[PDB]
Design an enzyme around this catalytic site. Structure first.
Site, PDB file in Angstrom:
ATOM      1  N   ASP A  61       0.865  -1.180   0.000  1.00  0.00           N
ATOM      2  CA  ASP A  61       0.000   0.000   0.000  1.00  0.00           C
ATOM      3  C   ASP A  61       0.902   1.231   0.000  1.00  0.00           C
ATOM      4  O   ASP A  61       1.351   1.681   1.054  1.00  0.00           O
ATOM      5  CB  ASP A  61      -0.930  -0.011   1.230  1.00  0.00           C
ATOM      6  CG  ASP A  61      -2.162   0.902   1.074  1.00  0.00           C
ATOM      7  OD1 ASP A  61      -2.340   1.535   0.012  1.00  0.00           O
ATOM      8  OD2 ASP A  61      -2.966   0.982   2.030  1.00  0.00           O
ATOM      9  N   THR A  94      -3.025   4.993  -4.738  1.00  0.00           N
ATOM     10  CA  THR A  94      -2.005   5.724  -3.996  1.00  0.00           C
ATOM     11  C   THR A  94      -0.652   5.657  -4.646  1.00  0.00           C
ATOM     12  O   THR A  94      -0.105   6.669  -5.073  1.00  0.00           O
ATOM     13  CB  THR A  94      -1.848   5.133  -2.617  1.00  0.00           C
ATOM     14  OG1 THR A  94      -1.656   3.718  -2.739  1.00  0.00           O
ATOM     15  CG2 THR A  94      -3.080   5.387  -1.808  1.00  0.00           C
TER      16      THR A  94
HETATM   17  N1  LIG Z   1      -4.065  -7.552 -14.027  1.00  0.00           N
HETATM   18  C1  LIG Z   1      -3.320  -6.519 -14.400  1.00  0.00           C
HETATM   19  N2  LIG Z   1      -2.618  -6.549 -15.545  1.00  0.00           N
HETATM   20  C2  LIG Z   1      -1.923  -5.403 -15.939  1.00  0.00           C
HETATM   21  N3  LIG Z   1      -2.027  -4.285 -15.098  1.00  0.00           N
HETATM   22  C3  LIG Z   1      -2.753  -4.320 -13.971  1.00  0.00           C
HETATM   23  C4  LIG Z   1      -3.375  -5.446 -13.609  1.00  0.00           C
HETATM   24  N4  LIG Z   1      -3.786  -5.365 -12.349  1.00  0.00           N
HETATM   25  C5  LIG Z   1      -3.660  -3.959 -11.914  1.00  0.00           C
HETATM   26  N5  LIG Z   1      -2.989  -3.355 -13.082  1.00  0.00           N
HETATM   27  C6  LIG Z   1      -2.483  -1.961 -13.112  1.00  0.00           C
HETATM   28  O1  LIG Z   1      -1.465  -1.749 -12.118  1.00  0.00           O
HETATM   29  C7  LIG Z   1      -1.642  -0.434 -11.560  1.00  0.00           C
HETATM   30  C8  LIG Z   1      -2.191  -0.563 -10.134  1.00  0.00           C
HETATM   31  O2  LIG Z   1      -1.252  -1.296  -9.340  1.00  0.00           O
HETATM   32  P1  LIG Z   1      -0.768  -0.805  -7.883  1.00  0.00           P
HETATM   33  O3  LIG Z   1       0.709  -0.880  -7.930  1.00  0.00           O
HETATM   34  O4  LIG Z   1      -1.564  -1.597  -6.919  1.00  0.00           O
HETATM   35  O5  LIG Z   1      -1.218   0.738  -7.926  1.00  0.00           O
HETATM   36  P2  LIG Z   1      -2.091   1.296  -6.695  1.00  0.00           P
HETATM   37  O6  LIG Z   1      -1.306   0.746  -5.568  1.00  0.00           O
HETATM   38  O7  LIG Z   1      -1.994   2.753  -6.937  1.00  0.00           O
HETATM   39  O8  LIG Z   1      -3.377   0.619  -6.972  1.00  0.00           O
HETATM   40  C9  LIG Z   1      -2.660   0.246 -12.462  1.00  0.00           C
HETATM   41  O9  LIG Z   1      -2.026   0.719 -13.660  1.00  0.00           O
HETATM   42  C10 LIG Z   1      -3.555  -0.924 -12.816  1.00  0.00           C
HETATM   43  O10 LIG Z   1      -4.228  -0.584 -14.037  1.00  0.00           O
HETATM   44  F1  BEF Z   2      -0.854  -0.282  -3.538  1.00  0.00           F
HETATM   45 BE1  BEF Z   2      -2.038   0.267  -4.236  1.00  0.00          BE
HETATM   46  F2  BEF Z   2      -2.638   1.466  -3.595  1.00  0.00           F
HETATM   47  F3  BEF Z   2      -3.027  -0.757  -4.651  1.00  0.00           F
END
Ligand SMILES: Nc1ncnc2c1ncn2[C@@H]1O[C@H](COP(=O)(O)OP(=O)(O)O)[C@@H](O)[C@H]1O
Ligand code: BEF
Ligand SMILES: Nc1ncnc2c1ncn2[C@@H]1O[C@H](COP(=O)(O)OP(=O)(O)O)[C@@H](O)[C@H]1O
Ligand code: BEF
Ligand SMILES: [Mg+2]
Ligand SMILES: [Mg+2]
Lengths: 537, 186, 509
Positions: A61, A94
């Site tokens: 996170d 985030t």
């Molecule tokens: N299954 C997936 N395949 C490719 N990209 C993904 C997939 N799952 C989440 N994403 C992308 O990864 C990013 C979100 O990941 P994350 O690192 O958790 O960001 P946040 O923590 O801000 O959610 C976004 O660009 C989302 O579109």
């Molecule tokens: F880590 Be992210 F906000 F899903």
């Protein structure tokens, strides 16, 4: 190298101007962002953050990593408070709202070094967003399962994701079941209900979803029942405490005749004892006070086999009561009397049981009149993984409450980014001038998410980033043939796929606020040209 | 007269003039939560709905078995009748001026005001009074023995919209503007 | 400060691997005793895994996660403590190469390990046979199994006895699962001296508290027990109870009242015609007198835990206020009230010639703690079976079965997804190996033979401890609760999966 001196303008502190500070800001935002750029995407990974005592926590996170990571410096805090905004607003996104922000400053700054006034760059980014927000509504759509999908893709960069299918389901399920109408319509999904719990033992998969709620308490005296009702039960959601009264803070008992001593005395026990009776005498089989119970006024429940729990979480009772239809009894009164009013204030529940979970053992109010409610209970290897399981179960289950409250999603997978990119990029010439470079930078800058989403896979990400680039660049040629944006990255395999099909869904409401926000920061920083740091005390 | 109230969150654009006026306080968590009453009449009680508060060295002595409930059940009504007189004067929304002196709205007096479906809102700073008496068109109420239906207002709506983790109060439809400002970073 | 990259990964793996390394010579029938020194003062001479790792503070985060594994596992089943640590390590270690050497991303190695776990769990229930939770003989030779590898073995039979004789005693089915709260209803009591055998499982309680007054019954035949919260002395007002007297002969008046209320209290108790009154709080000297001639012996100050266990072997439900003292609150179903003086220290018994009190005797206050813990392991695997009548091939047999059925499948899966899966198989094999090693026989030799014999000839074929030769379980038998084999593999694969999610480590709150 190294700024120094003063000479004139005697100021009680530090003060950097122009280039010096303007770069410092960019460096700052840069560092705070780069720590969490390795946590982006499914291929991204968690990190352990140890304190001074030696303990720690592992988590992806982005907002908690930046919170947990001690940041000292304005522009550093800024992106840690901006990473905060997201987790507070929508609830996920985030890690990304920061990476964007940093990229906008870093970039915009470069323009200034080229001799481009900050404002002319600012208005430029402002228009790139107007067009970009509008366009964002030309990739999104109404809910047309999109839910078990949203809830899944939001667990890619998380620990809970190895068991995606499982939790992705338990997530939507749990939430949905809690919906309400707030006031005058609404139909908002509780931005916080579904008491989540965790207990070490068993598989990660063996996480139960209670069919009601999980209040975390025992049963006052071990003497009362640990399981009641199979058919129907009357739940007493109180708030006022059942302990021996003490009268007014300013009510001296002045005795003049040794007679009254004994009398008024034992009266004390009974006053709050009558209150007890007037409650058992309502069909109360289950009592959930909030302010605790006496051991005296407990034996009354025990002698009567009444499951009565002491000092409960008032944040639960409020929801344990809306869930059994009961009433949070502040104090038995109504007009001018005294009673918990037999079943008038009570709640109807199917069964109240005290299930165990190795070491721990909590109470369950499963099955109820008007409950609809749920509550999840994680089970893992230890607290280290468990905190994080939930940590991201929330950063996931939140994505859902917003997909619902706002019927509109967009294809993630770094698609949104790519699209906006090439569109704004070409759109950039619709004003030419110096201002072109601005929008251009803005657009170009967005490709940070797709690049870093992939670089987190070690391989030469210049591949996908190029393909995905080209595609959209082409698709917007008759955007006619069979227009096909929604083409994101599939890092697990290493190829461009249709994310809408594949199942990669993200609520519009996120990337719409994630964007409008991250710039609001970049600009307030773009205007910074002198940082006077007063000396403290 | 141009009361601006800034609340963190959103961006700069999320700032509106707000038809009526903008309060600054919470509402009710405790006993029976109202938080919204369409077409209501508000009253600025400068009073204080708590047990007997004699400004001189008061004291309630006891020396009798039965005398117990005497003291008790009695003041139990003291808060009641005051609460009724409010409903009676057709006072929908109540506003208590923060009294650090000695209590504002007793915890008990809320069970009543809860049932009576009267959304109360405490801790109204003293510098507000004057101003609130304009935007709200309301009228200060020194005692309860002066709490009358005319010393109230024509509020068409009062509600604590939870903008998102924020919660801001509003009194819409009723020489005083009230603008609310937002942005990301403080 | 910071350590990103394989740098991180490595130190985590090595860390976790080292955790194992310590107690690996504590898994096996010939397992040694790790005498640990606690900060507070005394010592711990146990070989029970979790009881060791608890007494060792660690630094490296992974080493902290790896260490708590032994705890959550000691919470599910009472046994299989050391095993989970060793497995949890070897898993991470066996991934080490394909993790970096074969450059497989942590996502992929996790996607496989989570998969290989489930398949692996199948093979556990597949080889597990059920058992008669009621057949005293089976339960004994079951409990006996997890009593070996511990100082308490020289009385093995004697132990399973006190084990069953207590698991079943506090048990109480209930159905409208089986509930066995060994914790709150089997208060142990280690008493220095005597012989081991000189220890029994009294069906009642044992308090050392004597009697409130000298000339008071040392033992009521069939006593009428009355358990209460409230103390036995002149109470006071929970308000500003202040008395003003100028009326001369009024001093005597009030000072008397006190005696009067103590009287009343004694009445309400004496009423239901009691012989034994045990209160959690005190007993006014006056109240003693009126309860003396009232005809009953009194016991002051007894812990809640101590008291509520009495109320299950006397039925006497505990009651607060006496003016409400019901007669249902009897003291029926309670044998004698002995008050044996054990070496200059008076005790009191409440046996009946739902909750028992295991009373252990050995040869030191020190040696007893060995027993207590050893016993807990017995009394826990007994409870496990009670709530899951399934058992698994001991001697590390089960562990090898899963090694093959997985090894086979892995080899027949094809894709990078194979290597991590393959490792889980290669990993599992370490338990029969640690066993064979702590036996003395040749690991490469015995295993190849155990593994082969397994590959075809039955799966209930593990290694014999004191021997060092591969034997069939069914033969000399040493099955263990199937539940243990669950956790050991459930959380171990989880642990590995967690730590593999780390690619960066940072320091500061
Ligand atoms: N299954 C997936 N395949 C490719 N990209 C993904 C997939 N799952 C989440 N994403 C992308 O990864 C990013 C979100 O990941 P994350 O690192 O958790 O960001 P946040 O923590 O801000 O959610 C976004 O660009 C989302 O579109
Ligand atoms: F880590 Be992210 F906000 F899903
Ligand atoms: N009698 C024995 N002969 C061979 N193996 C044994 C014997 N007793 C215990 N085992 C095996 O060794 C492990 C139990 O050893 P132990 O030292 O008790 O560790 P734990 O603390 O996990 O119980 C299990 O794999 C069990 O199958
Ligand atoms: F050796 Be184990 F803990 F029974
Ligand atoms: Mg996410
Ligand atoms: Mg064992």
């Amino acid at each position: 190298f190294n700024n120094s001196r003063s000479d004139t303008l005697f100021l009680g502190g530090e003060k950097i101007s122009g280039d010096d500070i303007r770069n410092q800001n960019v460096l700052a935002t840069m560092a705070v962002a780069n720590v969490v750029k390795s946590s982006l995407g499914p291929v991204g990974l968690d990190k352990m953050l140890v304190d001074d005592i030696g303990d720690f926590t592992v988590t992806n996170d982005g907002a908690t990593i930046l919170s947990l990571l001690d940041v000292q410096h304005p522009a550093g805090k800024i992106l840690v408070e901006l990473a905060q905004q997201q987790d507070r607003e929508i609830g996920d996104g985030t890690t990304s709202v920061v990476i964007i922000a940093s990229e906008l400053l870093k970039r915009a700054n470069e323009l200034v070094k080229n001799k481009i006034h900050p404002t002319t760059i600012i208005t430029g980014f402002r228009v790139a967003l107007r067009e970009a927000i509008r366009f964002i509504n030309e990739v999104l759509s109404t809910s047309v399962e999109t839910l078990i999908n949203i809830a899944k893709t939001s667990m890619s960069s998380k620990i809970i994701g190895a068991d995606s299918d499982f939790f992705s389901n338990m997530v939507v399920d749990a939430l949905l079941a809690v919906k309400t109408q707030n006031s005058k319509g609404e139909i908002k999904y509780p931005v916080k209900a579904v008491n989540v719990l965790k207990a070490h033992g068993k598989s990660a998969t063996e996480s139960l979803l209670v069919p009601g709620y999980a209040l975390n308490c025992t049963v006052a005296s071990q003497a009362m029942p640990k399981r009641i009702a199979g058919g129907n039960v009357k739940i007493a959601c109180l708030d006022l405490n059942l302990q021996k009264a003490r009268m007014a803070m300013g009510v001296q008992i002045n005795i003049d005749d040794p007679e009254q001593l004994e009398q008024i005395r034992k009266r004390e026990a009974g006053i709050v004892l009558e209150r007890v009776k007037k409650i058992i005498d309502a069909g109360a089989q289950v009592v959930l006070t909030t302010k605790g119970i006496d051991d005296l006024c407990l034996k009354e429940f025990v002698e009567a086999k009444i499951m009565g729990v002491r000092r409960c979480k008032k944040e639960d009772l409020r929801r344990i009561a809306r869930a059994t239809g009961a009433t949070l009894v502040s104090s038995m009164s109504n007009l001018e009397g005294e009673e918990t009013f037999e079943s008038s204030y009570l709640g109807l529940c199917d069964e109240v049981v005290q299930a165990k979970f190795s070491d721990d053992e909590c109470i369950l109010i499963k099955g109820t009149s008007k409950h609809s409610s749920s509550s999840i209970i994680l089970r893992g290897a230890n607290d280290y993984s468990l905190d994080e399981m939930e940590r991201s179960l929330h950063d996931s289950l939140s994505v859902v409450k917003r997909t619902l409250e706002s019927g509109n999603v967009v294809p993630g997978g770094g698609c949104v980014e790519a699209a906006l990119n090439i569109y704004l990029d070409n759109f950039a010439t619709t004003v030419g001038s110096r201002e072109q470079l601005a929008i251009a930078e803005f657009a170009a800058a967005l490709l940070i998410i797709p690049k870093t989403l992939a670089v987190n896979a070690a391989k030469d990400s210049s591949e996908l980033v190029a393909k995905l680039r080209s595609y959209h660049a082409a698709s917007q040629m008759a955007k006619k043939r069979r227009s096909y944006r929604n083409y994101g990255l599939d890092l697990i395999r290493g190829k461009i796929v249709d994310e809408i099909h594949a199942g990669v869904l993200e609520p519009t409401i996120s990337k719409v606020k994630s964007l409008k926000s991250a710039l609001e920061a970049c600009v307030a920083i773009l205007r910074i040209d002198t940082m006077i740091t007063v000396d403290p005390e | 007269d141009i009361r601006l109230v800034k609340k963190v969150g959103g961006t700069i654009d999320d700032t509106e003039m707000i038809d009526g006026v903008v309060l600054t306080q919470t509402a009710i968590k405790s006993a029976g939560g109202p938080t919204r009453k369409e077409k209501a009449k508000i009253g600025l009680i400068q009073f204080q709905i708590s047990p007997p508060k004699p400004d001189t060295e008061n004291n309630i002595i006891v020396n009798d078995y039965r005398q117990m409930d005497k003291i008790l059940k009695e003041e139990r009504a003291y808060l009641l009748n005051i609460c009724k007189k409010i409903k009676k004067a057709k006072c929908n929304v109540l506003l208590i001026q923060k009294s650090i002196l000695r209590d504002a709205v007793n915890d008990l007096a809320l069970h009543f005001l809860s049932k009576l479906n009267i959304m109360v809102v405490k801790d109204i700073e003293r510098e507000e009074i004057e101003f609130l008496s304009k935007g709200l068109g309301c009228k200060p109420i020194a005692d309860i023995e002066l709490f009358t239906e005319d010393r109230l207002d024509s509020a068409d709506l009062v509600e604590e919209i939870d903008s998102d983790g924020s919660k801001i109060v509003r009194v819409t439809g009723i020489p005083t503007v009230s603008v609310v400002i937002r942005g990301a970073n403080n | 400060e910071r350590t990103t990259g394989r740098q991180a990964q490595i130190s985590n793996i090595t860390a976790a691997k080292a955790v194992a390394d310590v107690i690996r010579t504590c898994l096996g029938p010939k397992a040694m005793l790790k005498m640990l020194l606690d900060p507070m003062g005394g010592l711990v001479l146990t070989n029970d895994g979790h009881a060791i790792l608890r007494e060792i503070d660690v630094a490296h985060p992974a080493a902290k996660s790896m260490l708590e594994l032994s705890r959550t596992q000691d919470e599910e089943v009472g046994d299989g403590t050391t095993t989970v640590i060793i497995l949890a390590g070897e898993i991470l270690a066996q991934c080490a190469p394909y993790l970096i050497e074969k450059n497989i991303h942590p996502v992929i190695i996790i996607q496989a390990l989570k998969k290989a776990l489930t398949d692996a769990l199948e093979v556990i229930k597949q080889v597990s046979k059920p058992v008669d939770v009621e057949n005293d003989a089976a339960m004994k030779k079951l409990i006996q199994a997890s009593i070996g590898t511990k100082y308490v073995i020289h009385w093995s039979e004697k132990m399973c006895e006190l084990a069953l004789d207590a698991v079943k005693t506090v048990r109480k089915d209930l159905g409208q699962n089986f509930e066995i709260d060994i914790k709150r209803y089997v208060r142990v009591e280690k008493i220095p001296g005597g012989d081991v055998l000189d220890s029994r499982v009294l069906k009642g309680v044992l308090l050392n508290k004597d009697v409130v007054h000298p000339k008071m019954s040392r033992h009521i035949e069939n006593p009428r027990v009355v358990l209460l919260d409230c103390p036995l002395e002149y109470k006071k007002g929970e308000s500003q109870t202040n008395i003003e007297i100028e009326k001369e002969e009024d001093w005597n008046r009030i000072l008397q009242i006190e005696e009067e209320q103590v009287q009343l209290m004694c009445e309400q108790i004496l009423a239901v015609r009691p012989t034994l009154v045990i209160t959690e709080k005190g007993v006014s000297d006056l109240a003693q007198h009126y309860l003396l001639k009232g005809g009953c012996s009194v016991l002051r100050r007894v812990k809640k835990s101590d008291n509520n266990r009495i109320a299950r072997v006397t039925g006497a439900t505990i009651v607060n206020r006496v003016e409400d003292l019901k007669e249902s609150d009897v003291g029926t179903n309670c044998g004698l009230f002995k008050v044996e003086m054990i070496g200059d220290e008076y005790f009191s018994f409440l046996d009946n010639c739902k909750a028992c009190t295991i009373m252990l005797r050995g040869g030191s206050k020190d040696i007893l703690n060995e027993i207590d813990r050893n016993l807990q392991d017995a009394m826990a695997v007994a409870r496990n079976v009670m709530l899951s009548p399934s058992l698994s091939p001991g001697g590390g047999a089960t562990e090898m079965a899963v090694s093959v059925k997985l090894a086979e499948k892995a080899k027949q899966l094809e894709g990078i997804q194979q290597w991590p899966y393959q490792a889980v198989a290669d990993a599992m094999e370490c338990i029969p190996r640690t066993l064979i090693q702590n036996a003395g026989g040749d690991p490469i030799r015995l295993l190849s033979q155990l593994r082969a014999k397994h590959a075809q000839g039955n799966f209930t074929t593990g290694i014999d401890g004191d021997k060092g030769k591969i034997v069939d379980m069914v033969s000399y038998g040493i099955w263990e609760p199937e539940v243990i084999k669950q956790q050991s593999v459930k959380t171990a694969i989880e642990s590995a999966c967690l730590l593999l999610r780390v690619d960066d480590i940072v320091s500061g709150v």
